[PDB]
Symmetry: D2
Subunit: 488 residues, 4 copies
């Protein structure tokens, strides 16, 4: 045993956890109570499905950011009868009071704000380690890390079974992957069939985000996907709400908390004009920034221009802009070369994925550079050539979750009601043959249902078609109301 080894603790009831400070649980509970009222989709799910306990006997592992919002989700799953283990899908996204309340009251949770990468992958392993009764039956994933671990696990287990050999980190120069290989290697010593049992038992994964979904289709394409997946991201009531309106809320929140910078009057660059970029551009524009968009897609670019935004390449604006936000799901958007051209105290952040939209590696190794931490997740990197700095948020990781609290409860209720519906579907069809080792989306009538569940809370009064009218536009009175390919 390492002096510093990571060890699980247990509640008085013997449920495992590792969180920052259990003493935060009362605070967590207070904010969860407030969130419940803001999440009518999740609460209606509890009312409708609670009494029939549809998840009885089901074991669910989840990776969604361990926020107050995720708490209300977790407690919806447990209210429906599920047993649950959880981790966060980001080193900075956990809200420690939410983690503590869940660990105390409802589920095993391995999560805290300000994890190391080593601690992060440990947490992922623990969320997946159900012990001798086995599991999980079901996965809720956000970004595909959990799913990746299982797939790399099964691979490592096959090599092991057939040649007795273990993974070797020296085999990779990717620092995070070195971590992953080491975790799997030590895992082989404790249960060298962990992942194979998992893959024979897992009924499905529901995946929350665009980047995760892209990973899944790749795995389908190359025939490596080990089980059914529901693409929750592409529900309309997710993509067109969470990705768009959620960022419109949480991008400015992240900037304000992290820097207290005035947005009005500034020039802000948004790289990407998909759903996330549209929402970020809107916030910035609405706050009185002059927004310039970068894009690779001419349709998206043309949309930006119609909204009165300038579209240029980063090179055109790098020396002039005050705020830079990456929204692409791509890599190598803002490179060291760019960063060197930025004005003193330019703010640089990523709200897309991972840590590679911004060139943090090149920044680290810039000779003479000096990192000055202003406060947690606000860092000023000082360039010696100029004695000026740039302000990096959340070390290049998701800035909204890292520097503030992510999206608000109401819009996450939309996303998370889809997650519940997705889990209920996978589970209800465990023995059906209906889902293969492919990626599926939820049908439109359920997508509409999610929206309907949220209207009353806002006092929105929907019109009802007459039969005559429904006949005329050839839709049933109760919907669905739009064609399959409708874009909203």
């Amino acid at each position: 045993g390492s002096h510093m080894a990571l060890l699980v603790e247990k509640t008085t009831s013997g449920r495992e956890y590792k969180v920052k400070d259990m003493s935060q649980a009362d605070f967590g509970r207070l904010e969860i109570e407030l969130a419940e009222v803001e999440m009518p989709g999740l609460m209606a799910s509890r009312s409708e499905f609670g009494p029939s306990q549809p998840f009885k006997g089901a074991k669910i592992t989840g990776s969604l950011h361990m926020t107050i919002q995720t708490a209300v989700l977790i407690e919806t799953l447990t209210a429906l009868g599920a047993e649950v283990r959880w981790c966060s899908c980001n080193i900075f996204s956990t809200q420690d009071h939410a983690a503590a309340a869940i660990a105390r009251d409802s589920a095993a949770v391995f999560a805290w704000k300000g994890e190391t990468l080593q601690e992060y992958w440990w947490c992922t392993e623990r969320a997946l380690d159900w012990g001798p009764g086995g599991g999980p039956d079901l996965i809720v994933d956000d970004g595909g890390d959990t799913t990746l671990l299982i797939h790399e696990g099964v691979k490592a287990e096959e090599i092991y079974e057939k040649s007795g050999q273990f993974p070797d980190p020296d085999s990779t120069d990717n620092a995070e992957f070195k971590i992953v290989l080491s975790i799997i290697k030590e895992g082989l010593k404790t249960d060298p069939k962990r992942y194979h049992k998992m893959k024979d038992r897992v009924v499905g994964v529901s995946e929350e985000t665009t980047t995760g979904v892209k990973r899944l289709y790749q795995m389908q394409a190359n025939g490596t996907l080990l089980f059914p997946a529901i693409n929750v991201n592409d529900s309309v009531t997710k993509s067109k709400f969470d990705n768009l309106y959620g960022c419109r809320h949480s991008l400015p929140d992240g900037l304000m908390r992290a820097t207290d910078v005035m947005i009005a009057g500034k020039v802000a660059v948004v790289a990407g004009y998909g759903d996330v970029g549209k929402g970020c551009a809107a916030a910035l524009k609405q706050a009185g920034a002059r927004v310039i968009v970068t894009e690779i897609d001419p349709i998206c670019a043309l949309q930006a221009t119609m909204e009165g935004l300038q579209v240029l390449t980063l090179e055109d604006v790098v020396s002039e802009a005050d705020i830079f936000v990456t929204t692409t799901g791509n890599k190598d958007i803002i490179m060291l070369d760019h960063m060197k051209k930025m004005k003193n105290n330019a703010i640089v952040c990523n709200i897309g994925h991972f840590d590679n939209e911004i060139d943090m590696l090149g920044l680290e190794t810039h000779p003479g550079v000096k990192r000055i931490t202003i406060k947690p997740q606000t860092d000023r990197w000082v360039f010696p050539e100029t004695n000026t700095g740039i302000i990096i948020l959340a070390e290049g990781r998701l800035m909204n979750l890292g520097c503030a609290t992510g999206h608000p409860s109401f819009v996450m209720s939309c996303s998370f009601t889809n997650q519940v519906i997705a889990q209920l579907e996978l589970w209800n069809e465990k023995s059906s043959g209906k889902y293969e080792k492919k990626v599926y989306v939820l049908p439109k009538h359920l997508d509409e249902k999610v929206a309907a569940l949220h209207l009353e809370k806002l006092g929105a009064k929907l019109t009802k078609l007459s039969k005559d009218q429904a006949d005329y536009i050839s839709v049933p009175v109760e919907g669905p109301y739009k064609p399959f390919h409708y874009r909203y």
Copy 2:
């Protein structure tokens, strides 16, 4: 107007309001060209190869300056063209005149009667003893409807000698259509059969018409291939949305000169058109109330800070009403009677049945006063107050102003050209069945790319390494099939 075709010196038929307006037409067309780079680029790319050489194309699409640039794109690519408008009020007479003079047979004028409208439609389809069209450009499906109904009438007539009976419908307009088919049977009982055997396909522009097409495919009655142009991203998400955001306020201001700021405006529907109309109104300083049947669209509206209510909750409060639904019976007489004095009522959706024009016109003791063309004040006897109806409840943007501007119509129309070229180029290959198709994404993206230089929008280019990372080709397509933008 004498419903007798006239002819250019060269022998080309036409009927328009006033040929002397041609010079003025041409001046505006020349300006429009600069605003329509997608269409002009199409002329430069395809001009030399004359892909429409020998093609006969009938179009039914509002005869505006923008349509003129489209027509003149088809003819530059070698097509022979006949045209009519798809709305009685949407023609711009100077556009009509310039086209009739310089480029194509046109049967269209602003302020047609319904009888005139249908006569123009027939003329536009009448390629004479020779036959035609090979291709159809359609907006709202009337032309397409006429051919399908005709064929059906012909099959019956051939057998039992039975004619269409206008008594079989209570729809005043459809009676006209039935009577038109009956007369046609009495001259050539195989007109529409011959026609349908020769049509390579139709490209349909609008949401309503496209809806009609899929239904025809479903019930197996569609006679020839159709390209759904509406659902090109660069059509639906631009024209229907940004177009109305421009042309809805234009229509309101021209027709009434009413201040929008400070008012309460109701937008029925929150689809692409309703989204654009609500945007315009809110950006102008109106407080916008939206009605919807779709909870997803309703939630979208609320997220944009708009109130969502039933019409019944706001009918006596709103100053301006705009229908955008593509449905019927949105604003009924019983609603209109409750409206405040001089409430403005209009439709930007479809046809003339979103608003209860029939109920209004037949309301006992009602009085109509024309303020000016396409702005009518109706006074009710019970209250002695009035409402203002725009364009007799037909598309108000085209009726009361000039519809969408050239730049956005260049997006829609570039899609129309691509669709036509696809149908014609594949006329003999059997690629297209008697079904409804949409253009592939690479083409949709090409349309957008063609419009960026004009606005000085500079695109980033992916490195091969980045393209691999997100699994797309450097040159695209950039998004998955199901992407909603």
Copy 3:
């Protein structure tokens, strides 16, 4: 047009484009009334007492449907009225006709020449041997200018017999004014003296004209009291701002039908007018660039997310240029020559000198092509590219569309009525010196209060306890003297 006054059956003089347009005028006036509750409330309050009984009022204010409601408010209160427009293109001929027929002497039409403009101004001031006006309503100060220049010419002539010499000015328009005064001297050398002795005061509407007035007060040449109507809060902060936010895009769309969304638009100036124009453009989806000389206004613009640059930095990039400065030489020939093909250039500020029309018209080898009235394309020989000038560089909103809507003009015009009533009611009391005054706040607030019920805005009423707490009367005025809103 024959510059010979015509007369109604009753003997009232007029000159308009076409009297047959009166019916149409009246229909629109009837609609405008409903939209102008401030003016209609003024008729109900003051009608019975006929405060203008026996008054002779001359007005020089764009002869629009809105002005018609104002005119008809003065006459309802008992005034006799003569009127001309203050811009050569701003008259709405149906409004002119209806007023000429039913209510007042009017000398105005759309598309006057400068000679006609000044002739109309003289007629509007010509009350005959009897004398008048007692009161003047002025917009931009031309009428006021004419009287002051005339008096000055008369004082010189009386002594030395010297006439104004048009050679003394290089301003083509002012030559006209000088020649008009000279001719007047040759008939009645005391016209303007008699006039000025009889005028109780003037109420001036616009920023530029008000500026002229304070200058006259400063240099001691102002001949009679003046009320600054522009600087009523319910004028400056509504009309100049929200009015243009409506009428700037209306003008652009009518004149050119160009899509605003996606474009780059430059707004010179960021005062009340520039604020409103920039709002409109940005809300329509243009990317707006502002020019300014005032660092406070410039900072305001940047806080609204607008770029602030010099014209020189954007002249070849912008698609649309709008001048709002009230200054001269904003857009010069040298700028215009650098503009992209079909760049749109217009002025919503003052006169015709914000844009270098003179420099443009005299540019060797330049060619003007009229697309249609008030939309001109000028082609330069060096480049063979063109620009589009709206309304020959005169106020584009009134020139190319219909100016501001009725509701906001009801705010401005209610202030005009209050100002006139104040001057007239105090004609004999010596309350007003030969200086420039603004209306008190309680009146400014009354104007706003009169327009709230129409929009369904419900005000809160202070408790006595609350009024005491913030040191205002329950019934107001609610803000300190210097409050900027």
Copy 4:
């Protein structure tokens, strides 16, 4: 000595302070450095005036909220040679790291977040207690509390001098005034001529806010104002920037930090549509709330309607609204009677003044009511009649400073450059006779100057008039550019 008595501490250099935690000073310094870059008006003031030390020998007492922004102000005054003592003008507005850095490095500061009213008035007394060398010469005030203390002090001193009698709190039923009278009473025991010496020596006060300014004109009107005052609020580059754009930034910041509530989709009521209300309405509208305005002023009301906002009385909307913001500077806007009609978890806050826009007194004494603190300055008050709650921010005190960090540095640079200019004027004219015991505003050329100092930072390029042009509009090339009564 009370076991709990409040006692000043002293730096190693013997400068007095009382702050939360001196150990926060490094953090304070890091954020002050960032703020300096965002405050070019204050930094240019240092460059222009530093070398001539115009405040040499001057003693300045200030009450502006003890934020990072105020720090940069304080350090501008000290850079110009001033000696400074400071307190915050609000119990919740201090940023403890800003207070610590100033106490350590630059000035005596008595301020911490989460003061009691007793501690607040103590802090005010200490900021004013210069000791035997006397002072202050100059006052910077925000809300007029400091100014009030001096004026009530002089009164109490006259009664004392003439009859030997002391103030008696029992003489007032206002709980805060009881505190004030008690402070003065104990003060008489230590220096019974403190306030009289003060009033013979103070050269002027510069007052920052609308409510404070109103107090001053009253004092002028009734002949009680003891010295010259500059009305900083009514500089254009204050009122039309700070009050408007500042709230547009800091209102949503306060709501988000305090509640993480989604603003989009909600109904928000803004009471008042002056500069603060305009800025708050804009934020809310921009964030996707449907905003309803209340007003007493028909001009302001009409402005709101032109911006597409509904104008109604509170009674019309109280049961339906989700968020209520008071912006009036008036009292008794949201009463217990209203609060009883609000939906569960309605958010209620004040961004105007004091604690009396919201009926906190009536709320306190509502029978059966239960206050549940979610976290500092977010309280849920549970109504027994309904078992529902309302969420009160910052106990009804300024919510932007209380729940977040107030306005951002750039806009406060505009306000605080006016303050510097105001102090320099009062001081430079100490012996002039130019200022009487009245309220003055700064001339337009200085107002323009403040704006000009901030343009370059934003890259705004100003056009220069030709002589010809300046002649034409009759302004000098170098301004001022607008008439005296111009409203902007």
